[model samples]
Target chain A: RGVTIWLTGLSGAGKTTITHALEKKLRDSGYRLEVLDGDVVRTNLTKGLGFSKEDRDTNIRRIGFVSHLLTRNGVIVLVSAISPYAAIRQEVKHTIGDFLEVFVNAPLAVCEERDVKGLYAKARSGEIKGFTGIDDPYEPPTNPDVECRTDLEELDESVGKIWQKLVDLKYIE
Target chain B: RGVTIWLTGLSGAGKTTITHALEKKLRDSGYRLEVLDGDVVRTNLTKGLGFSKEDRDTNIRRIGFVSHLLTRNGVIVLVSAISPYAAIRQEVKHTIGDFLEVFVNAPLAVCEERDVKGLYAKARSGEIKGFTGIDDPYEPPTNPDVECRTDLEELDESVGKIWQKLVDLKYIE
Candidate 1:
């Protein structure tokens, strides 16, 4: 059976970057892996979907379904999204069947400092509305397959942690 | 520039089957092309999504965005979907820019007879909820580039009609 590993967290928490690096690692290691990064998915898969709560839930559900299907066809899916709602995340976990939820944890300050798209600053300055961890609420996963703090841990270590967790979950075996 | 052809119709309307034939024809004719079929995409690109209206819309939107991206990168995208909503179709048209909405209008009776997987029968029997064109609605394109009625047309003739439409649209010389 294939596996769907959903990495969820706040903006600039290194979900996209880590998922990209891990996808390469998995691919080079001879696994049929595909990464669905948030920005990439937004531009390519969920182009018409806006940032409304309902839209976000629908978007994640669609991604979850697609990821599950790929897994059934013997492809490993690495999904990185700011799936901030616990209820939606739980729904995905139930739908995906073999889901490994990874909580990408990083301090708000650190995330703002690492803001690659200036989204954090925009949210802070009130230029952007409904920003996760700011105007919008982000419910952290109480239990997850893995949790990585990008600010506290080294990049290589963080990636290594996820890889180890995948191995532990027997998803990489 | 590459062409984006959206094939919309009911189940067993020969959408994917015809798309496969057309893909083969286009490939034999020396065009670099990709097909995003409904079943194949549900299995490959969107496995975990459900049959709910929200999920269905998201699924179609995801396919549209991916098709648009591939076309932007100089690859022709032939998308075969049951996409029942005109609003989402319009969104795809606006996003892709070079959209060719092709309605594969197969009559309900003909499609039920074809049945392919007995889905239409199930929908009619009320065994399946939210079935497109039965419990759900299928909005035929108001200004489709071409309309191929599978019930009354031969495969070769339908294929010819699509090709003619493409030629008229300046996608082919």
Candidate 2:
């Protein structure tokens, strides 16, 4: 079955790392998959959108629409976006019926500390406004199918949990 | 093999009719295919976009990006959009390597007469600005892979031409 594995979390919460790892595992298993990273999509799909609430929801919905199209057409889609709003996440889940939400969890301080790009530092310094988990709000998923505690577990463990979840759901062998 | 068959022409140029007919044929042939129509994409993909030159290009490119994603992943995509700009069409063709441009041609008078949506009348009355082939521009393809003259041919004839073009290119058996 086609499925959408959406990884939603704060910036620097290890979503990208887990996404790549899971992608490798899935592709290695001979599954057809596509990855939609926020940074890459901002260039291709939602170019002129900004960080405001409306734009963010629009971005999430746009991604959801594409995911729905791909998923319905029998493609596994891995979306690693900081879809901070719970309502929008649920909205996307409804749009894509065969959807799996994965919350890549880490506390704000840990996410700030893990900020390799110094974006958290910039947000704290008032250089970037409306940043998720910083000046902006981040309403995490209330009931995600999987929660990858990046602060607690290793990458393989998180990936394995997700892989196992898919296996149980019969999304993969 | 994956391929994108892009149908570009004026609004009332029978692109949608030809698209559905071609879609049925390809599905009957057991080919995995997806159709990206302009009106449907305007709602799901580019909701807030206006009809300005830049917005039109953005719309076309967004569709092209999704088509590239599906085409590379082994899906035949049928894109029926009035992609009026030659440069943007060429840009999309380059982005999608295995691309086929089908120009659905009909003269302005014929298109205006065939306007079932009253879009031509609206454009003539200045109710709709930037209407392609009414008050705005439509730079037809100088060298399209296939030309379907809807004014001079039946829907099946037009679709047959496109199907034969695909066969000649070895995109289908």
Candidate 3:
């Protein structure tokens, strides 16, 4: 059996960045892993789903089901999604135990400054609706398994924090 | 790292029963395995779809994507669905190699006779339409990797044929 390391945060909260580092670290430790990035998985599994709360939850649940099946058969699954709801996260944790919920903590201003995609600028200009941390609510995890404040920390150190969490949990030596 | 043993058959043609035996045989051999049954998977992964040709093909491809990911991470997946399309199956074959396509074969007469759920009866009575081998087409695989004739053989022997296929592929020694 294996665990699901779920990364939830705002759009520009460095979830994907930290995920890549975590992937590298885990692979170097000889662990089999897969990443369910929000953008890519949406295309593959959850396409035609609009950005409504029910639809977003549907996407998350689909990913969770896949993760659960993979976990039972021994594969560490990491999911990076701009999952803006706490209830859904809690529900998923219930479904797939040994859940490591990683909160990629980044202030809105900090994220906007680093947003190369210009999504935040567009959202602020009233272009994108239901944008997390702007139009949509991003309920920060009150009790995350690991909290990496992406704003304050250096990139490598942010990755190291999550890597240490894996070690501490004895998922990796 | 793991092969996906795909079992396609008409309704009431021993797919589930043989899948159970395959699950047992593989587990007993100490192989990590998972079974994606038609009913359960439809609820979890392919919900809100019906018996249309497009919907059925969508169901097959969705399961194929899931199986592809699991195989990459080393879990032998068994899929039992009345995936009544050859074109979609071929598409999946290209995606996930090491694909053991098991055609769980039985004549329509034999299947209808053994129809414990009265599905065949309902379809024949016009209560259900688009039923495979009734109204909808049941396009058999032109070149399935394995074939298990559930009509002529005992359950154990039917299971053995697929088991031997796995052995022949060196998935198990």
Candidate 4:
């Protein structure tokens, strides 16, 4: 059976970084897995969708649906999206029958400090609107299978938590 | 601004048929337009892609990139695809700056009957694999700009019709 591991959180929460790490680890371990990150998805997969709430919902749902389908076909899917709504997250969980929700948590202040692209600064200065965790809301996962603090934890530790969860769930056996 | 018109549906739903017709119409009307059909793109855009879902998505994304870029520079692009996934459809919309999704909705039974190349029959009998709307899923657009039901409409009516939408959207003045 295919398994979908959905990593959701606010922007700059290390979702993409950790997901990429996990994907590398999984691949090295001889697993058939693909990581669908937000940046890559935005540039490659979900290109034309503007930063609108409705568009974001549709984008995340579309990715989730495809990931679920891939999983059903026996491929492991790692989706890292700043999928900001609790309701949408629930919907994704329901859609992808065998889903592992991992919440990449980080404080807004820390995210701002670690803003590699300076998106948080832009959001703070009103240069950009609808910035997740700044202008827009980011409803953290209420009952995630794993929660990793990007602000306090090292990258290895964060990825290790996810690996542990996957092993525990027998998704990586 | 550029505009990408994604024409999708079952085979014989007049996707390629309509796209070619539209291409000629737009050309005659002196509009800058290009038609990207499945067979034509297989040689160029999807050269190395297999019939797998992942490969299909990649192919579609590549086509989307080219169309998006062209359209962004003020060209009109008509893409006829059996792109069955709503996820990829959504991705194309997101990627192309100005996109109008046109779902060429046709019944499977009708498509089977209209299979000029015996594709549907082959797919149904396991002679062929990864046929959209048969072996593969055909995710209909939830909010398509237009839905051309070839089963109920005449060929001319179906093909000559999108002109009005183009005019209304100021794509052809």
Taking chain B only, the TM-score of every model is: 0.95, 0.98, 0.96, 0.94
- Against the true structure, candidate 4 has what lDDT? 0.79
Which number leads on DockQ?
A: 3
Write the number of the candidate with greater lDDT, choosing between 1 and 3. 3
lDDT of 1 at A61: 76
Residue-wise lDDT of candidate 4 within B1-173, one digit each (tens)? 35888898877777888887888877887776667787777764355467788887877886786576456546688899888788888988987758888888888888888787878778889888878767787788899888788889876787756777777887777
For A1-173, candidate 1 gives per-residue lDDT tens digits of 47888899999998988887888888898887667887777776666678889889868876776575566545678899999999999998887788889889998888888888989899999999999998998999999988998888877887899899778878886
Question: Model 2, range B35-151, lDDT digits (tens) per residue?
Answer: 999998898798888888998999999999999998987789999999989999999999999999999998889988988798999998998988998777899999999999988
Model 1, B172: alpha-carbon shift in Å?
31
Ranking by lDDT: 2, 3, 1, 4
How many residue pairs clash (N, CA or C atoms closer than 3 angstroms) in each of the candidate models, in the order given? 7, 0, 0, 6
DockQ of 1: 0.14
Query: Positional deviation of B156 in candidate 4, in angstroms?
Result: 30
**DockQ ranking from best to worst?**
3, 2, 1, 4
Interface RMSD of each: 7.2, 1.2, 0.9, 14.0
Error of 1 at B17 (Å): 11
The regions of model 2 sitting more than 4 angstroms off are: B28-30
Worst 10 residues of 2 chain B by lDDT: B128-137
TM-score for each prediction?
0.59, 0.94, 0.94, 0.55
Report the first chain's TM-score for all candidates: 0.95, 0.98, 0.96, 0.95
- Residues B1-173 of candidate 1 have per-residue lDDT tens digits of 47888899988888987898889998898987777888888874676777788888878987986676556545678999899889999998999898889899898778888789978778988999888878888888888988998888999999889988888877876
Please give the lDDT score for candidate 2: 0.92
Chain B of candidate 2 versus the native chain B: what TM-score? 0.98
